[PDB]
Amino acid sequence: GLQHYKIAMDPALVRLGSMISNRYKYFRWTKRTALVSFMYVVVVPSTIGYLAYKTDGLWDLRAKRRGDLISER
Amino acid sequence: RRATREEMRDAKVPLAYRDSCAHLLIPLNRCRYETYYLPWKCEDERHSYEKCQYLEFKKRVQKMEELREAKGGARSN
Amino acid sequence: SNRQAALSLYRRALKLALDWTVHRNLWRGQALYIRSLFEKNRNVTDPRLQRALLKETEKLLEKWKHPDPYCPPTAPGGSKYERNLPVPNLEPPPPLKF
Amino acid sequence: PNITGFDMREFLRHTKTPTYDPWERHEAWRYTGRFSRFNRFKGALPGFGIATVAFTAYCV
Amino acid sequence: VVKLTYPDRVSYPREFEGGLERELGGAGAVRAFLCLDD
Amino acid sequence: MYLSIIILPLLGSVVSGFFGRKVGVSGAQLITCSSVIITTILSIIAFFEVGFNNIPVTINIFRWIDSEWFIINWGFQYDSLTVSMLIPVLIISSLVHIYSISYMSSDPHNQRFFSYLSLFTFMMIILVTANNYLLMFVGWEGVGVCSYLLVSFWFTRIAANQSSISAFLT
Amino acid sequence: GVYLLMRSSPLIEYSSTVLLLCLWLGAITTVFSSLIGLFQQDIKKVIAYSTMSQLGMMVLSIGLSSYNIALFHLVNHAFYKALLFLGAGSVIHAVADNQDFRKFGGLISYLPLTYSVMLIASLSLVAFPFMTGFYSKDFILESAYGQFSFSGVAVYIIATIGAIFTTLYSVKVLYLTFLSNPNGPRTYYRLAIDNFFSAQAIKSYKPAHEGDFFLTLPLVILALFSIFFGFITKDIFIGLGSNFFVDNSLFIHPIHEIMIDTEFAVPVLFKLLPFIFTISFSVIALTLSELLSELVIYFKFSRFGYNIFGFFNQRFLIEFFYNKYITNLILNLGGQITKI
Amino acid sequence: SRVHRFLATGLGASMWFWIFYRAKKDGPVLLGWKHPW
Amino acid sequence: PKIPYPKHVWSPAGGWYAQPANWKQNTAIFGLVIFGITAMVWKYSAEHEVRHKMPEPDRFYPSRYWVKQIKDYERAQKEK
Amino acid sequence: QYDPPTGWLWGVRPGEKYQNEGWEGPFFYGFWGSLIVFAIAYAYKPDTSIQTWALEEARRRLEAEGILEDPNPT
Amino acid sequence: MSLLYVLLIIPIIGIFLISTIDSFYFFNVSYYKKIALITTILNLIVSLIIYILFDFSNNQFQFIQENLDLSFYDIYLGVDGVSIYFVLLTTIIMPIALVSNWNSITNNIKSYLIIMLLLETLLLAVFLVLDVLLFYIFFESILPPLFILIGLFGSSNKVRASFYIFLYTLLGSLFLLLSILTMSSIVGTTYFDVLLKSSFEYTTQLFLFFGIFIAFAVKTPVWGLNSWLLRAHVESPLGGSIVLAAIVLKLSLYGVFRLILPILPQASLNLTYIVYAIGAITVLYASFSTLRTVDVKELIAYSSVAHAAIYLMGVFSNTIQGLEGAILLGLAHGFVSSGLFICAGGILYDRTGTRLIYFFRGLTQIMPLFSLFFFILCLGNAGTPLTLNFVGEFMSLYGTLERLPIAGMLASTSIIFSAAYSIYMYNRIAFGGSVSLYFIDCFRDLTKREFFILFTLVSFTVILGIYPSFVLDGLHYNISSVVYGIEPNASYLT
Amino acid sequence: EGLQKVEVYERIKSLLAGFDKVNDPNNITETAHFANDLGLDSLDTVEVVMAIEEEFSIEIPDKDADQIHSVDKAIEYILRQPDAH
Ligand SMILES: *P(=O)(O)OCC(C)(C)[C@H](O)C(=O)NCCC(=O)NCCSC(=O)CCCCCCCCCCCCC
């Protein structure tokens, strides 16, 4: 809308920003990429979720004296 | 005479120094209070308390002269 | 080409001897020894040997490089460099409403 | 080995004060009365000299 | 090197009258040295 | 005295930092250094008060975080560790404040410099005078912010910028 | 951080595990620091590395469950370390803000007050006898051996090298700045006694003068502390049975108290050993600089000595591995998520 | 300004004079000769 | 020398070499403000500083002259 | 030497003065003014929190124990 | 008449006034902005009066109005402890959002002002209705005004941004709608009082959880479902970008307090490890990417994804501390996020026309006041103490940790990573050089309008961070009703 | 207040007089060339700049170390760098 200050618009920097903005159109399912997508979308959440499942209710600190245990399961 | 706990809890001496010699610790801690802990004021009776520290220490180092030989000079620690 | 680079490595050589030996007495002996090496191969003429000779001493400068060379405080990499840089544009902003 | 005639041992052997250099007349100022081996350590322990006399006086 | 040659302790563990039982927190807390094994 | 030791360095920094236009250079130095000298005087007194007499003092101003079981207070406890720890902090801060009048006498941004070291002073007192771990963490987080702001005081130097990210993130 | 463990002492006294890690974190840190400070070419870098060695000495003492000594050393270190930083600060100001040792020397005749206060600060840091820093740090070493355990005796050894290399950097800062031959330019040293100038005698001299009132007054005040403060206050913190922290401020459990054995069980040689190792290693450092002074140059160009010079100058290469394996990896993980 | 020289020497003189004084009295004790008592 | 800088930039900490002509008059005003509320902090502290031990009458303890929780104790003990 | 303080607050040059855009009266007299007036009124709002109610009962419950010596012996 | 209906009808009077003055009197577009601004402040006045009559320890809904005119769909309004602070935050933010875009909106000013006033009524109805079908009716009613606002006043990629927000929200909501419909069939209504004393079968609770959680996961947003936010928060005008990140994101956090915790107790407890897996994955992934984001707006926008994960984990804590800190976090976040969008999308963008961090450097040399507020704002985004962000961060992390330690540990890496990108962005814009050399034209510092809306926002986040008892006091009693559990010796007393 | 013309000349004049390899101390002027006027060569002249840099505490880049071949250029090159002390 309203005019802004004069900026020394770098052609290289404005084409890097356009490439980064438009990058989603050129993605393909290649050999390495499916491994990256599988690793970070499936494996890592699955590992984090599984350890949460196996440690749920396991420990409690609330008022544990000497003679009790942190573990409850 | 040894200082019983009743006048020795009231004296507020530290836990790690709650032992036989602490009867001389109570007067030593009063000079420190009264003289602002200056290390030139009650050197006299400070030496007395430090002296009784030495004797009880010596009785606790001679007690292994039979204990160390009982273990044949082994690692007692 | 083949003349400027030779002189540049001379300064790098003397700079690196002082950088390692702090004592100005002792680098003076070292610096005098370096000048002999540059003087000894003054008459080398064949460009094939000249390029090879220059390449070898670049490794020597690398093989005994100092972990941190001296850099004057105002020099790029010095302690005082870029410390209180002034603004590039001293002129006031043009009249714009934001 | 080392087509350039640089040998580290002879580099190390030439690590001293040279008998002749093209540069003493500008470099000699560093090894002078202000910066002699004696005048530089003349005050390495600033107050040591006076205290020794004072301590002896107190002892006597 | 230190493990092979490090000195044994010099003094017996300090004896404490009553093991500092009450004033170290009672039986519910750790006590001091009193006529125990060495 | 025991709440004035805490608050006084904070006032010097606020005036030196937000009204340094009005107090100028020498006024900002006069205010910040006086607030630290006076705070030093009291913390020397508070040493004799607390330490030499074995009389700790407790001040609870108001509650910071109230949530069921947790009641965190804006509260301050002076003990033998507190007054002992306040001696080096306040004495050295006073001298460094005096040291800076002649050391940074060439740097242009001289109000911001004196406001930061008077802000660091405040945080280091907050840290050691707290009742609890969470009020101690306000001084701990604040000392990091003050150290960041002073490691990157010459913020046009990239080297000072990288060394301040390292300080704040580590 | 040292205050946090001292404050938390009532809690951490009931777990010997954290006191054992305290005792070994500090021991590793005090020697990791002294070995690095010797090879640094910036003065402020050496003083920073000395700060972390004495901070390790504080952490090691907490591991000995002697929080009174750590407080005493935390206080005594504060007074002399500032004097070292502030005294060095006047050195950088005297020269054209140079911070490299390679450009100093002979400045003792130019900075007489600065050298004297930095010498006082250096003796307290090395724990020269009867000085403020002596009463604090040297007693941690006795306490470490006083704890008649494997770890205590081990870290007495670990810290006694740290004492040796502290003396070596202490000498390097003190010698290369004031006692050495001039390594900087004419400008730092060209006094007005010699003319050397025809029509510009008014200016261009600037021969590294001393400071002004506001710059030197803290240095004189901090000097008093480094000579006397430790002696005056040694009963409050150390004592033998002092009751200063009887509000349960610094909590020590009877079970692993080592105060009585430290004053009685340690052999006389071990108590006085760091003094012997400090005089011996300081004259050698003086002897290997302006007295023999080739052996360092021989070592700096020996193939083996070249690598360990760069290993310790580059700070155990820790920063090199931190960037390419932690921060760059974090930066590349982000790149994977944004782009792929 | 000769005042700087006097403070330098004074601090050095005050320092050293203290070590001899602190060695005249406390010196025998830490050498294993005389226990404090 | 002196670094050049824009004269159009307004800073609350002052700017580049900012010393007002009235620096002393305003430093006086701010110093009174600092003293004024520091006394208020002093008044609040003296009323809510709580102790569990009473200092000895013969001992240096300047807190005794303003803090209420022991000021009343001295006069309460002055009744026998 | 030191320089006098300088700069254009809000970007208003020394020759000119700040010009109101239309949001100032509503923002200062309305939004900020209401928030201040709300603040003083909050100082008189009666306490309705579950703690101060539960502290009162809990005070009595601990009073009927060895803790918290009650003012009246009943 | 209830004060709660006064809240809803005041912005409609402003719509009527704005659209009608032209007939009453070429009216200057400045008058509509004064009408729109005055309307929002009158609304804040009623909310401040409601909060001053509010009772902090009452379980019955307050400020209700008798209807006795039962139709199939009726609008019932009520306010309790949980919903009142969300109401106050909408009323506090809307005047600032209008003043933020005072000069930037140059065309279609009636359209811009009418949509914002409509959005205020619709957003406030969400926290005020007393029915779960009413809740959905207003949660999804904001889609048309938000679609038109982005396309009319958005940036270059506005069409894609306006398509992304509507379609994701429409899709996630249709899954929430199927769950809300199943409940109405079982209970016969979704009025809160009736529906709250319903105890669904566990298997039903599981299939009710999903769909509801599918919806809220898209509107949280959680990582992997967050493409709409980066497109729509960046392309949206600054005023609409403020409303989207301060109020719109907080409808799903408040929706857990009405649709998940009180009626799906067992499913929430059993499926917590899924939520904490997504939340911890979201914290890590949303943090590493915003380190690499080169759009300054996209970087501030996507840090919200990282904070939204933190109070989403705190709302599943089943801990009174985590639940309260989650509300405090969502409340504090709407302050800091609003200010950061002003700093980036309003102050940098209006001066430079570009959002690329490449072109910015060393603005402290020219803009002292901007760096002052932008630094306190980055400290709040990093969860530094003396800021309400810290208190919400700290309390919801304790609840997350106490519920699932390992998930709370992984979530507790945001202390490192949120500071990692807040100071990295600060040191590249305000610091890190003298002044960017792409600025061939020197800038002006903060204007009075830029100074006041920022000063107000950092004021709320700081006063409430030094005394969070202002919010925590009215929040304690009502969140006590959303915890699920008993003690072995404090239950079934006789 | 900065470096002056008279300051740099007298400082540099006392420096190149430190060689034992120049023709004579009386053969140096403001416009004295390092090769034609006074006695040096290809390898000596680069040692002069590597002493000039030391005694002005600056850094001479290799690209600018070649144009400097006379005393006059040395005088003016110093005045162009404000970092000289
Ligand atoms: P002037 O003498 O400037 O004339 C130079 C001329 C034009 C003669 C050229 O040098 C030339 O044409 N020479 C012949 C061909 C050539 O290009 N030679 C270049 C010189 S080779 C040389 O000097 C070999 C030895 C280099 C130095 C080895 C040691 C490096 C330093 C090691 C430091 C280790 C740590 C202190």
PDB file of C-alpha atoms in Angstrom, chain G residues 19-172:
ATOM      1  CA  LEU G  19      29.969 -34.909  45.935  1.00  0.00           C
ATOM      2  CA  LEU G  20      32.143 -37.426  44.093  1.00  0.00           C
ATOM      3  CA  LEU G  21      31.244 -35.847  40.758  1.00  0.00           C
ATOM      4  CA  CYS G  22      31.848 -32.437  42.330  1.00  0.00           C
ATOM      5  CA  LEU G  23      35.306 -33.594  43.390  1.00  0.00           C
ATOM      6  CA  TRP G  24      36.222 -34.829  39.900  1.00  0.00           C
ATOM      7  CA  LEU G  25      34.568 -32.135  37.789  1.00  0.00           C
ATOM      8  CA  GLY G  26      36.676 -29.522  39.558  1.00  0.00           C
ATOM      9  CA  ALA G  27      39.883 -31.551  39.469  1.00  0.00           C
ATOM     10  CA  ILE G  28      39.583 -32.073  35.719  1.00  0.00           C
ATOM     11  CA  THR G  29      38.614 -28.423  35.223  1.00  0.00           C
ATOM     12  CA  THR G  30      41.481 -26.939  37.250  1.00  0.00           C
ATOM     13  CA  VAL G  31      44.058 -28.804  35.146  1.00  0.00           C
ATOM     14  CA  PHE G  32      42.155 -28.535  31.849  1.00  0.00           C
ATOM     15  CA  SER G  33      42.362 -24.772  32.421  1.00  0.00           C
ATOM     16  CA  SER G  34      45.985 -24.372  33.518  1.00  0.00           C
ATOM     17  CA  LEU G  35      47.207 -26.405  30.542  1.00  0.00           C
ATOM     18  CA  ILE G  36      45.333 -24.086  28.171  1.00  0.00           C
ATOM     19  CA  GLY G  37      46.245 -20.754  29.759  1.00  0.00           C
ATOM     20  CA  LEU G  38      49.961 -21.366  29.251  1.00  0.00           C
ATOM     21  CA  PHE G  39      49.610 -21.422  25.457  1.00  0.00           C
ATOM     22  CA  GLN G  40      47.272 -18.458  24.979  1.00  0.00           C
ATOM     23  CA  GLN G  41      48.682 -15.415  23.196  1.00  0.00           C
ATOM     24  CA  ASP G  42      46.004 -12.965  24.474  1.00  0.00           C
ATOM     25  CA  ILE G  43      46.406 -11.651  28.088  1.00  0.00           C
ATOM     26  CA  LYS G  44      42.635 -11.571  28.823  1.00  0.00           C
ATOM     27  CA  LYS G  45      42.352 -15.160  27.531  1.00  0.00           C
ATOM     28  CA  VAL G  46      44.994 -16.280  30.102  1.00  0.00           C
ATOM     29  CA  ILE G  47      43.132 -14.486  32.975  1.00  0.00           C
ATOM     30  CA  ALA G  48      39.809 -16.055  31.845  1.00  0.00           C
ATOM     31  CA  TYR G  49      41.436 -19.522  31.833  1.00  0.00           C
ATOM     32  CA  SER G  50      42.913 -18.821  35.306  1.00  0.00           C
ATOM     33  CA  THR G  51      39.363 -17.917  36.505  1.00  0.00           C
ATOM     34  CA  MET G  52      38.079 -21.409  35.479  1.00  0.00           C
ATOM     35  CA  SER G  53      41.013 -23.213  37.174  1.00  0.00           C
ATOM     36  CA  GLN G  54      40.224 -21.472  40.489  1.00  0.00           C
ATOM     37  CA  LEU G  55      36.511 -22.185  39.855  1.00  0.00           C
ATOM     38  CA  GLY G  56      37.437 -25.824  39.508  1.00  0.00           C
ATOM     39  CA  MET G  57      39.296 -25.455  42.796  1.00  0.00           C
ATOM     40  CA  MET G  58      36.024 -24.215  44.287  1.00  0.00           C
ATOM     41  CA  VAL G  59      34.041 -27.129  42.844  1.00  0.00           C
ATOM     42  CA  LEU G  60      36.660 -29.661  43.958  1.00  0.00           C
ATOM     43  CA  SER G  61      36.436 -28.328  47.517  1.00  0.00           C
ATOM     44  CA  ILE G  62      32.644 -28.715  47.512  1.00  0.00           C
ATOM     45  CA  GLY G  63      33.219 -32.341  46.541  1.00  0.00           C
ATOM     46  CA  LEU G  64      35.347 -32.607  49.676  1.00  0.00           C
ATOM     47  CA  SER G  65      32.173 -31.452  51.480  1.00  0.00           C
ATOM     48  CA  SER G  66      34.129 -28.475  52.805  1.00  0.00           C
ATOM     49  CA  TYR G  67      31.884 -25.590  51.791  1.00  0.00           C
ATOM     50  CA  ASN G  68      33.582 -23.187  54.194  1.00  0.00           C
ATOM     51  CA  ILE G  69      36.832 -23.389  52.230  1.00  0.00           C
ATOM     52  CA  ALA G  70      35.017 -22.927  48.921  1.00  0.00           C
ATOM     53  CA  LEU G  71      33.369 -19.796  50.301  1.00  0.00           C
ATOM     54  CA  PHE G  72      36.734 -18.601  51.624  1.00  0.00           C
ATOM     55  CA  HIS G  73      38.372 -19.279  48.259  1.00  0.00           C
ATOM     56  CA  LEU G  74      35.440 -17.853  46.298  1.00  0.00           C
ATOM     57  CA  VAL G  75      35.861 -14.648  48.303  1.00  0.00           C
ATOM     58  CA  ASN G  76      39.661 -14.500  48.239  1.00  0.00           C
ATOM     59  CA  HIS G  77      39.805 -15.279  44.475  1.00  0.00           C
ATOM     60  CA  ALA G  78      37.371 -12.402  43.794  1.00  0.00           C
ATOM     61  CA  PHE G  79      39.676  -9.763  45.199  1.00  0.00           C
ATOM     62  CA  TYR G  80      42.925 -10.706  43.450  1.00  0.00           C
ATOM     63  CA  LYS G  81      41.403 -11.890  40.123  1.00  0.00           C
ATOM     64  CA  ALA G  82      39.717  -8.497  39.655  1.00  0.00           C
ATOM     65  CA  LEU G  83      43.069  -6.810  40.381  1.00  0.00           C
ATOM     66  CA  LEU G  84      44.664  -9.036  37.674  1.00  0.00           C
ATOM     67  CA  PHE G  85      41.889  -8.192  35.139  1.00  0.00           C
ATOM     68  CA  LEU G  86      41.890  -4.507  36.180  1.00  0.00           C
ATOM     69  CA  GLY G  87      45.694  -4.333  36.227  1.00  0.00           C
ATOM     70  CA  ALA G  88      45.824  -5.989  32.806  1.00  0.00           C
ATOM     71  CA  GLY G  89      43.142  -3.534  31.688  1.00  0.00           C
ATOM     72  CA  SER G  90      45.505  -0.685  32.410  1.00  0.00           C
ATOM     73  CA  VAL G  91      48.143  -2.466  30.311  1.00  0.00           C
ATOM     74  CA  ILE G  92      45.840  -2.727  27.287  1.00  0.00           C
ATOM     75  CA  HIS G  93      44.889   0.949  27.771  1.00  0.00           C
ATOM     76  CA  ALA G  94      48.548   2.040  28.023  1.00  0.00           C
ATOM     77  CA  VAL G  95      49.401   0.465  24.662  1.00  0.00           C
ATOM     78  CA  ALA G  96      47.198   1.071  21.632  1.00  0.00           C
ATOM     79  CA  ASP G  97      44.640  -1.445  22.957  1.00  0.00           C
ATOM     80  CA  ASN G  98      46.964  -4.321  22.094  1.00  0.00           C
ATOM     81  CA  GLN G  99      46.188  -7.615  23.811  1.00  0.00           C
ATOM     82  CA  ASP G 100      48.989  -9.813  22.424  1.00  0.00           C
ATOM     83  CA  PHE G 101      51.982 -10.695  24.589  1.00  0.00           C
ATOM     84  CA  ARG G 102      54.116 -10.687  21.417  1.00  0.00           C
ATOM     85  CA  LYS G 103      54.008  -6.842  21.456  1.00  0.00           C
ATOM     86  CA  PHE G 104      54.831  -6.071  25.118  1.00  0.00           C
ATOM     87  CA  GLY G 105      57.973  -6.081  27.296  1.00  0.00           C
ATOM     88  CA  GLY G 106      60.056  -3.553  29.185  1.00  0.00           C
ATOM     89  CA  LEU G 107      56.841  -1.903  30.413  1.00  0.00           C
ATOM     90  CA  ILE G 108      57.946  -2.205  34.054  1.00  0.00           C
ATOM     91  CA  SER G 109      59.676   1.177  33.869  1.00  0.00           C
ATOM     92  CA  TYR G 110      56.536   2.520  32.160  1.00  0.00           C
ATOM     93  CA  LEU G 111      53.889   0.941  34.416  1.00  0.00           C
ATOM     94  CA  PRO G 112      55.434   0.850  37.902  1.00  0.00           C
ATOM     95  CA  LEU G 113      52.160   0.806  39.839  1.00  0.00           C
ATOM     96  CA  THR G 114      50.536  -1.555  37.337  1.00  0.00           C
ATOM     97  CA  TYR G 115      53.385  -4.059  37.598  1.00  0.00           C
ATOM     98  CA  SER G 116      53.446  -3.919  41.401  1.00  0.00           C
ATOM     99  CA  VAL G 117      49.721  -4.597  41.806  1.00  0.00           C
ATOM    100  CA  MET G 118      49.782  -7.344  39.165  1.00  0.00           C
ATOM    101  CA  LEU G 119      52.734  -8.907  40.994  1.00  0.00           C
ATOM    102  CA  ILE G 120      50.796  -8.830  44.271  1.00  0.00           C
ATOM    103  CA  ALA G 121      47.800 -10.350  42.494  1.00  0.00           C
ATOM    104  CA  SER G 122      50.017 -13.027  40.937  1.00  0.00           C
ATOM    105  CA  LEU G 123      51.492 -14.187  44.247  1.00  0.00           C
ATOM    106  CA  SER G 124      48.024 -14.498  45.781  1.00  0.00           C
ATOM    107  CA  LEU G 125      46.882 -16.524  42.707  1.00  0.00           C
ATOM    108  CA  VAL G 126      49.952 -18.863  42.974  1.00  0.00           C
ATOM    109  CA  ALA G 127      49.354 -18.993  46.740  1.00  0.00           C
ATOM    110  CA  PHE G 128      52.677 -17.532  47.769  1.00  0.00           C
ATOM    111  CA  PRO G 129      52.805 -17.976  51.560  1.00  0.00           C
ATOM    112  CA  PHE G 130      51.152 -15.465  53.894  1.00  0.00           C
ATOM    113  CA  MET G 131      49.066 -13.826  51.157  1.00  0.00           C
ATOM    114  CA  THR G 132      45.299 -13.694  50.754  1.00  0.00           C
ATOM    115  CA  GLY G 133      45.119 -16.423  48.114  1.00  0.00           C
ATOM    116  CA  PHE G 134      47.577 -18.592  50.051  1.00  0.00           C
ATOM    117  CA  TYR G 135      45.275 -19.261  53.007  1.00  0.00           C
ATOM    118  CA  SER G 136      42.378 -20.338  50.761  1.00  0.00           C
ATOM    119  CA  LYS G 137      43.557 -22.407  47.798  1.00  0.00           C
ATOM    120  CA  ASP G 138      46.443 -24.170  49.533  1.00  0.00           C
ATOM    121  CA  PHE G 139      44.060 -25.424  52.209  1.00  0.00           C
ATOM    122  CA  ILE G 140      41.874 -27.107  49.578  1.00  0.00           C
ATOM    123  CA  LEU G 141      44.948 -29.064  48.475  1.00  0.00           C
ATOM    124  CA  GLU G 142      45.614 -30.130  52.062  1.00  0.00           C
ATOM    125  CA  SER G 143      41.941 -31.023  52.492  1.00  0.00           C
ATOM    126  CA  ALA G 144      42.004 -33.096  49.296  1.00  0.00           C
ATOM    127  CA  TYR G 145      44.824 -35.240  50.658  1.00  0.00           C
ATOM    128  CA  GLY G 146      43.332 -34.829  54.133  1.00  0.00           C
ATOM    129  CA  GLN G 147      40.392 -36.849  52.869  1.00  0.00           C
ATOM    130  CA  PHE G 148      42.309 -40.124  53.052  1.00  0.00           C
ATOM    131  CA  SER G 149      40.555 -41.667  50.062  1.00  0.00           C
ATOM    132  CA  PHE G 150      41.638 -42.738  46.598  1.00  0.00           C
ATOM    133  CA  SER G 151      39.814 -39.863  44.899  1.00  0.00           C
ATOM    134  CA  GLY G 152      41.096 -37.243  47.330  1.00  0.00           C
ATOM    135  CA  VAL G 153      44.726 -38.268  46.924  1.00  0.00           C
ATOM    136  CA  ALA G 154      44.157 -38.700  43.184  1.00  0.00           C
ATOM    137  CA  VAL G 155      42.854 -35.150  42.738  1.00  0.00           C
ATOM    138  CA  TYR G 156      45.585 -33.783  44.967  1.00  0.00           C
ATOM    139  CA  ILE G 157      47.884 -35.049  42.222  1.00  0.00           C
ATOM    140  CA  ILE G 158      45.483 -33.806  39.536  1.00  0.00           C
ATOM    141  CA  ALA G 159      45.489 -30.357  41.139  1.00  0.00           C
ATOM    142  CA  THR G 160      49.240 -30.244  41.778  1.00  0.00           C
ATOM    143  CA  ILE G 161      49.974 -30.145  38.051  1.00  0.00           C
ATOM    144  CA  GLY G 162      47.319 -27.442  37.862  1.00  0.00           C
ATOM    145  CA  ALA G 163      49.335 -25.582  40.480  1.00  0.00           C
ATOM    146  CA  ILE G 164      52.498 -26.044  38.404  1.00  0.00           C
ATOM    147  CA  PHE G 165      51.046 -24.721  35.153  1.00  0.00           C
ATOM    148  CA  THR G 166      49.343 -21.874  37.026  1.00  0.00           C
ATOM    149  CA  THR G 167      52.799 -20.722  38.073  1.00  0.00           C
ATOM    150  CA  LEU G 168      53.920 -20.991  34.450  1.00  0.00           C
ATOM    151  CA  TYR G 169      51.158 -18.762  33.008  1.00  0.00           C
ATOM    152  CA  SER G 170      51.578 -16.394  35.995  1.00  0.00           C
ATOM    153  CA  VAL G 171      55.224 -15.968  35.002  1.00  0.00           C
ATOM    154  CA  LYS G 172      54.350 -15.608  31.316  1.00  0.00           C
TER     155      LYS G 172
END
